[PDB]
């Protein structure tokens, strides 16, 4: 499949991107950018431990 995606124009997806061991994270939520933003608003301390 390594050679396959190169030569044969084919698209990978969420699941296979996951299983190749590519990305850890994966959401199903709406406006997850906004839910990150407001969480990091309510956050308060800017120390690496925090």
């Amino acid at each position: 499949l390594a050679e396959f995606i190169m030569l044969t124009g084919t698209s990978l997806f969420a699941g296979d991107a996951l299983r190749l061991g590519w990305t850890d994270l994966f959401t199903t939520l709406p406006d997850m950018s906004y839910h990150i933003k407001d969480w990091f608003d309510t956050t308060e301390h800017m120390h690496n431990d925090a």
Binding site: D24, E44, H45, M46, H47, N48, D49, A50
Partner: protein, 425 residues
Amino acid sequence: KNLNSWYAKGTMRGGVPRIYYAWMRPGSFTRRRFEKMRNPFVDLETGTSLYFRDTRDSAEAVAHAADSKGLKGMDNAIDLYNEYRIVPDLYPEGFQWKHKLNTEYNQWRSNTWLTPDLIPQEHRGRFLCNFQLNIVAYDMRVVKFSPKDHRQWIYCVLYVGSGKGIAGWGRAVAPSTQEAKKEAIREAFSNIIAVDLEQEGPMYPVRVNADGVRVLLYPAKRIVANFRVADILCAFGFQHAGCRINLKATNNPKSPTHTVEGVFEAVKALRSVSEIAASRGKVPHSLIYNIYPYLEEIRRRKGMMAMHPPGKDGLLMPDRVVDNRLPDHLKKGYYDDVYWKDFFAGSREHLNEPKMGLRGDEMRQRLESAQSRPISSSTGSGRRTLEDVLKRLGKTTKDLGSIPIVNPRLDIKLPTHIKRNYSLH
């Protein structure tokens, strides 16, 4: 170009002393909860993986392609002590030693421990500030407990302040002078207020409105306000401030009550500068001297220092088991070549048998520590154990140096001693 000299400022109040901070507030002075990892974050484990997010790609982390292993810069830990202080320290540690109790701290450092009924419950063991009470003005209001019964309820206003930063004001109604005074003092220690004196005054005109008295705290070169209001601002420690009330002392309503209430309301409405900044999300000019260690470590992470080892992750994963744990009869001999003969004399954790190797003298010393446990009837006998035998001799249970008995209170014959202790020595 600023012909306001900084060297001629502040209005002298006689002897009234007001605190001044050399650099930063004594609260934000100390940072143990962050240098020593005493925080909910270090406890709650979640997220400690991110410090080792770099091991997503094993080959990449060993390769050290980008130095940027760090969650926040070049290293996981770069300037953990300065760079994080860049944020407006709104919620500072303060005083956090449990060395001696809250009670004994409050007691050594404050005239409030002497007056317990005065501090309400929340503030009890807290304060370390010597509060001066200034009783603004007593009054008398008739209280009608019934149509036929009326009392004279004296009504006090007073402000308990120390120019060290902390000052509240309480007014009370109570039938007697000293009881209304105490009631108002406890209401004041409930209405206690503090102030970020880092700016030593308001940095913007605070135009507040207390219970009918239009107050304006503004910046002046020096405390320029009423005698009463000025002693209140000096009870807070404001060196450069000025409060004006009602626009003029002919403007009603005026009263000692309204004056104290108004100035304290304004000092409450005041926002710190660090709080203003953080509220605007912006870095205050004042604290940018903290990123300078990180800016310098940027500028000095050129070349060799940014160079990270090839293939060396620092994460030296678990693989096998090691057991240097020797049998005790063996570690009893192990160091005999290397340190003093019979290294392992008396470490319980070390020697799985705790007593072995010791000379009877040191075992006798353990026993001297040990005390006489009661004697149940079966254990109690008309025989005289070497305990009371050596009592009658008076000499010592430590005298029998050559005699291999160690614990005379054992109801066992001399060789039974020496056999229960032959395994060891």
